[PDB]
Amino acid sequence: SGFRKMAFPSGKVEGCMVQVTCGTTTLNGLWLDDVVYCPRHVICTSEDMLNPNYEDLLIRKSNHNFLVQAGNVQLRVIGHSMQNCVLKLKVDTANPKTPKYKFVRIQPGQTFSVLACYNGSPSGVYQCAMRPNFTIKGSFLNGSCGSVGFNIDYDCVSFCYMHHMELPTGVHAGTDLEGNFYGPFVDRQTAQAAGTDTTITVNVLAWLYAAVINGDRWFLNRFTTTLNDFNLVAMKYNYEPLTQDHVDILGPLSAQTGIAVLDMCASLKELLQNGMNGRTILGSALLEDEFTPFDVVRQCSGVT
Amino acid sequence: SGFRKMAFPSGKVEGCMVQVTCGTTTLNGLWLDDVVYCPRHVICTSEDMLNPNYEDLLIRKSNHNFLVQAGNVQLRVIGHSMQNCVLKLKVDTANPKTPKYKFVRIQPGQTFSVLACYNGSPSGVYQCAMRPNFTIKGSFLNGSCGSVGFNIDYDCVSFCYMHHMELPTGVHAGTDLEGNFYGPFVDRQTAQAAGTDTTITVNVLAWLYAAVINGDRWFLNRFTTTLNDFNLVAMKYNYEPLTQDHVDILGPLSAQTGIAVLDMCASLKELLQNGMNGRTILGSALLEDEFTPFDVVRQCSGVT
Ligand SMILES: *CC(=O)N1CCN(Cc2cccc(Cl)c2)[C@@H](CC(C)C)C1
Ligand SMILES: *CC(=O)N1CCN(Cc2cccc(Cl)c2)[C@@H](CC(C)C)C1
Numbered sequence: 001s002g003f004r005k006m007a008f009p010s011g012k013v014e015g016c017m018v019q020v021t022c023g024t025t026t027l028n029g030l031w032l033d034d035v036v037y038c039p040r041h042v043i044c045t046s047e048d049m050l051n052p053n054y055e056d057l058l059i060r061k062s063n064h065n066f067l068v069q070a071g072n073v074q075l076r077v078i079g080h081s082m083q084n085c086v087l088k089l090k091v092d093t094a095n096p097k098t099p100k101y102k103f104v105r106i107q108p109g110q111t112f113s114v115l116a117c118y119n120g121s122p123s124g125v126y127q128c129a130m131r132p133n134f135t136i137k138g139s140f141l142n143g144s145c146g147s148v149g150f151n152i153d154y155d156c157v158s159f160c161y162m163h164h165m166e167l168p169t170g171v172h173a174g175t176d177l178e179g180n181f182y183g184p185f186v187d188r189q190t191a192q193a194a195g196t197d198t199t200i201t202v203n204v205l206a207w208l209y210a211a212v213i214n215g216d217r218w219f220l221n222r223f224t225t226t227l228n229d230f231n232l233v234a235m236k237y238n239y240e241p242l243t244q245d246h247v248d249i250l251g252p253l254s255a256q257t258g259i260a261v262l263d264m265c266a267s268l269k270e271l272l273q274n275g276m277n278g279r280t281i282l283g284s285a286l287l288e289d290e291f292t293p294f295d296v297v298r299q300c301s302g303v304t
Numbered sequence: 305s306g307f308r309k310m311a312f313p314s315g316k317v318e319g320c321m322v323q324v325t326c327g328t329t330t331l332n333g334l335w336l337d338d339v340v341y342c343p344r345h346v347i348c349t350s351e352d353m354l355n356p357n358y359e360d361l362l363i364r365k366s367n368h369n370f371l372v373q374a375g376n377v378q379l380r381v382i383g384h385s386m387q388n389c390v391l392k393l394k395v396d397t398a399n400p401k402t403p404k405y406k407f408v409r410i411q412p413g414q415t416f417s418v419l420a421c422y423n424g425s426p427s428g429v430y431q432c433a434m435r436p437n438f439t440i441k442g443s444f445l446n447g448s449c450g451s452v453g454f455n456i457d458y459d460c461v462s463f464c465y466m467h468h469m470e471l472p473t474g475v476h477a478g479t480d481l482e483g484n485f486y487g488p489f490v491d492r493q494t495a496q497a498a499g500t501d502t503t504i505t506v507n508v509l510a511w512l513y514a515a516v517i518n519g520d521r522w523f524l525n526r527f528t529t530t531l532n533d534f535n536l537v538a539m540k541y542n543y544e545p546l547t548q549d550h551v552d553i554l555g556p557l558s559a560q561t562g563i564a565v566l567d568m569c570a571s572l573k574e575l576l577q578n579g580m581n582g583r584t585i586l587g588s589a590l591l592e593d594e595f596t597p598f599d600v601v602r603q604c605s606g607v608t
Contacts, residue, residue: 001443001444001445001470001474002441002442002443002444002470002474002475002476003443004430004442004443005309005430006420006427006428006429006430006443007311007428007429007430008428008429009314009315009318009419009426009427009428009429010313010314010315010429011313011314011315011318011319011426014313014315015315115313116310117608118606118608119608121608122313122315122608123310123313123602123606123607123608124310124311124312124313124603125310125311125312125313125314125429126308126309126310126311137306137587138306138308139305139306139307139308139310139603140305140306141305141604141605141606142606143606144606166305166306170305170306170518170519171306172306214474215474275582276589278579280590283441284588284589284590285580285588285589285590286584286588286589298427299428299443300445301445302422302427302445302446302447302448303427304421304422304423304425304426304427
């Protein structure tokens with residue numbers, strides 16, 4: 001037992017990290033097969049970032065201008081291209097450590113692990129959720145750009161995120177591995193509105209089931225509710241509306257604990273209306289939303 | 305910016321995990337050089353766990369009874385020995401993936417990453433603190449025994465913990481890599497008292513400095529205190545007494561933020577006496593104690 005914000009083992013991703021330098025800018029790249037993926041802003045200078053003309057900036061660059069180092073070995077760049085906000089540098093050597101992988105575009109509310117990297121070297125790993133407003137609340141300093149988010153299904157790494165920037169509010173924005181930003185963000189040093197965020201209701205419910213599985217049951221009550229009544233409370237407290245698809249995904253957890261999803265919704269309703277009353281749930285004094293129902297099942301069963 | 309409960313990249317440890325089977329019991333082992341380290345309770349049966357006579361149980365075992373598999377390859381066991389609560393199985397092959405490593409016995413209040421493993425395969429990674437009462441609040445199911453805790457200094461992995469058991473209270477107990485339990489715990493299915501735990505004061509203070517560095521400053525006040533006055537509040541709220549060694553270790557963070565350690569102690573004093581008043585600090589509604597001053601500096605600087 002016990003419930004922790006667990007990240008995937010980062011080994012398969014560590015083996016893909018490289019350092020990419022262009023002129024005087026250095027960030028992280030992801031070396032998979034014979035391609036190195038990195039944020040296209042690696043081609044900018046400090047004066048370029050207000051509104052870079054990336055097509056023009058990339059034209060002044062040749063394959064030899066992109067310095068790619070994997071640890072101590074230098075990769076030979078034989079091709080370069082921009083796809084959306086990422087640069088794809090073709091190298092003459094396939095990464096011997098390339099795991100089985102996929103590029104996926106995650107949905108808001110889904111989770112993933114981030115391997116924070118600086119100068120091509122891994123510093124740490126943490127579990128993130130893609131917020132409903134398409135930002136992530138990460139830990140990223142200067143040089144962390146090009147660090148990636150991923151999930152691992154047995155031996156397959158599904159890369160879902162690449163870090164590009166920090167908004168003036170301290171939240172993080174980035175792209176999928178095809179270079180498309182999540183949310184309305186653009187890769188320029190401009191003030192950008194992150195949309196109104198909401199709490200991931202299905203995840204808070206999944207976490208309440210994890211709490212019941214692990215012994216924390218104080219919040220369980222003698223009440224039930226309906227999807228419509230619960231959604232009136234969710235709207236008031238800036239929670240995502242709960243749908244039947246969300247109820248269906250909570251099926252396994254409802255089955256294991258024997259607590260109907262709507263009864264758990266009534267517990268959540270009372271927690272939203274009354275607060276925690278100085279108590280904790282799974283060591284937290286607030287309602288956690290960065291564990292999906294899948295994460296809860298995986299952690300509570302022992303999937304490797 | 306941003307502050308997260310970050311674990312070390314687990315790659316160097318993943319490469320050491322093996323599955324150890326003895327009779328019908330299977331748990332995880334750590335393969336370093338030509339030695340596989342695992343909890344000695346791998347030699348027990350269900351009827352043995354009330355009070356195992358490990359010396360007698362190990363005598364009925366031969367090298368061929370210890371089945372060690374690293375992924376799909378079978379290791380050949382050429383020696384076996386018990387050192388405290390760990391078994392050391394000498395194998396005929398040095399692990400090609402053995403990183404630079406040390407065995408260290410961590411101090412209470414210090415942190416480390418745990419690579420939870422099942423059947424020799426890594427499931428996830430999380431950051432833990434060794435509680436002042438020598439337990440850890442982990443996430444460990446049946447089969448997780450033999451999973452290890454570690455820190456990484458550049459290329460050197462300092463292994464500090466091996467998981468052995470879950471106390472009836474849901475907290476976790478284990479040993480250093482020489483097989484000595486942290487705390488008064490013994491490897492038997494007996495009800496065992498975990499000592500009175502306390503909050504790691506120096507870590508909560510280190511985390512308050514991380515909050516100030518990252519923008520959360522609401523808790524800063526116009527007050528100061530003394531070590532003696534603060535310690536009267538710490539005693540009341542079951543916080544570890546703050547010493548000059550702790551003040552000294554907070555030196556760098558005090559220097560960076562320009563907030564004297566005793567002024568931060570007065571902020572902590574007011575937070576202890578008044579609570580959070582429905583507010584949060586670094587996304588938490590309680591006082592976090594599982595980040596050391598070293599962890600804060602590392603995360604806030606970008607050490608890889
Ligand atoms: C991710 C990272 O380390 N950095 C944040 C982005 N910086 C450039 C930038 C500025 C404004 C908007 C965007 Cl999309 C990108 C990085 C600059 C260094 C020199 C790599 C730092
Ligand atoms: C760590 C783990 O997976 N397990 C917890 C300990 N179990 C045996 C046990 C019982 C009582 C006290 C101690 Cl020190 C150890 C493990 C049993 C399986 C069969 C490995 C499970």
